[PDB]
């Protein structure tokens, strides 16, 4: 499509988030690069305001699905790159079961040769000593497919999926994601048939980094068609 050509090589990525969860305000800056040819993302996030007041794993999905590898036979279904470079708005509600919710509004677009994800996050109705504000989640990440359908009325897409965060006691903290993406430009975009993204994420730490941070390595492939 349009932006598909913008992703044939390695693209630098910047992520900027401002958050407020139950009145706890924080900002995060991330940098890395993506290589959509391999569905590959490498990112490092730093909390610039001090200690992150929620667990890092709960922000992975908020912190650029244009880097997904769409198989050649599935190229007409790749909404995300088709909206580039002008980009898209990505909005979610993330419901943490028996706890609060995040609402996020993000704009994903090129600034020059750099793909930028700018996010505002608002979290409300969290429990003071629940799994999120009480930091009871393991620093790890599992799988789960991301389901995408057309929203042929907002000329965008609707995405739904579940994340299961691991609680330190061996249980699971469900995070139900509801997502909508809509192009920023007027340009034509690709409205896909139903399909899913297969995702894998690995979380790590930089041994030399003394700020609160997360290193993220992810691989994403479109499938289901």
Curated annotation (Swiss-Prot):
Biotechnology: Green fluorescent protein has been engineered to produce a vast number of variously colored mutants, fusion proteins, and biosensors. Further generation of mutants led to more stable proteins (at 37 degrees Celsius for example) with brighter fluorescence and longer fluorescence lifetimes.
Gene3D superfamilies tied to this protein: Green fluorescent protein
Listed result of changing residue 199 to I: Suppresses the 475 nm excitation peak, leaving only the shorter wavelength peak at 399 nm. In H9; increases fluorescence at 395 nm excitation
Effect the entry attributes to changing residue 171 to G: In GFPA; leads to enhanced fluorescence at 37 degrees Celsius. In Venus; leads to yellow fluorescence, improved maturation and reduced environmental sensitivity
Effect of residue 143 to P: Increases fluorescence at warmer temperatures such as 37 degrees Celsius
Effect of residue 68 to A: Increases fluorescence at warmer temperatures such as 37 degrees Celsius. In GFPmut 3; highly fluorescent mutant when excited at 488 nm
Outcome, altering residue 141 to C: In mut1.9; shifts fluorescence lifetime from 3.03 to 2.74 ns
Reported function: Energy-transfer acceptor. Its role is to transduce the blue chemiluminescence of the protein aequorin into green fluorescent light by energy transfer. Fluoresces in vivo upon receiving energy from the Ca(2+)-activated photoprotein aequorin.
Known partners and oligomeric status: Monomer.
Protein name stated in the entry: Green fluorescent protein
Organism: Aequorea victoria
Gene expressing this chain: GFP
């Amino acid at each position: 499509s349009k932006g598909e050509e913008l992703f044939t090589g390695v693209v630098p990525i910047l992520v900027e988030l401002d958050g407020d969860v139950n009145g706890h305000k924080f900002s995060v800056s991330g940098e890395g690069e993506g290589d959509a040819t391999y569905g590959k993302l490498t990112l490092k996030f730093i909390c610039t305001t001090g200690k992150l007041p929620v667990p890092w794993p709960t922000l992975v999905t908020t912190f650029v699905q244009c880097f997904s590898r769409y198989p050649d036979h599935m190229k007409r279904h790749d909404f995300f790159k088709s909206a580039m470079p002008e980009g898209y708005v990505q909005e979610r509600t993330i419901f943490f079961k028996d706890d609060g919710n995040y609402k996020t509004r993000a704009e994903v677009k090129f600034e020059g040769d750099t793909l930028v994800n700018r996010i505002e996050l608002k979290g409300i109705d969290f429990k003071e000593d629940g799994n999120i504000l009480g930091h009871k989640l393991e620093y790890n990440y599992n799988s789960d497919n991301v389901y995408i359908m057309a929203d042929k009325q907002k000329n965008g897409i609707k995405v739904n999926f579940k994340i299961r965060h691991n609680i330190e006691d061996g249980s699971v903290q469900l995070a139900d994601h509801y997502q909508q993406n809509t192009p920023i430009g007027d340009g034509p975009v690709l409205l896909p048939d139903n399909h899913y993204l297969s995702t894998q994420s690995a979380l790590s730490k930089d041994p030399n980094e003394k700020r609160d941070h997360m290193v993220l390595l992810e691989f994403v492939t479109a499938a289901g068609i």
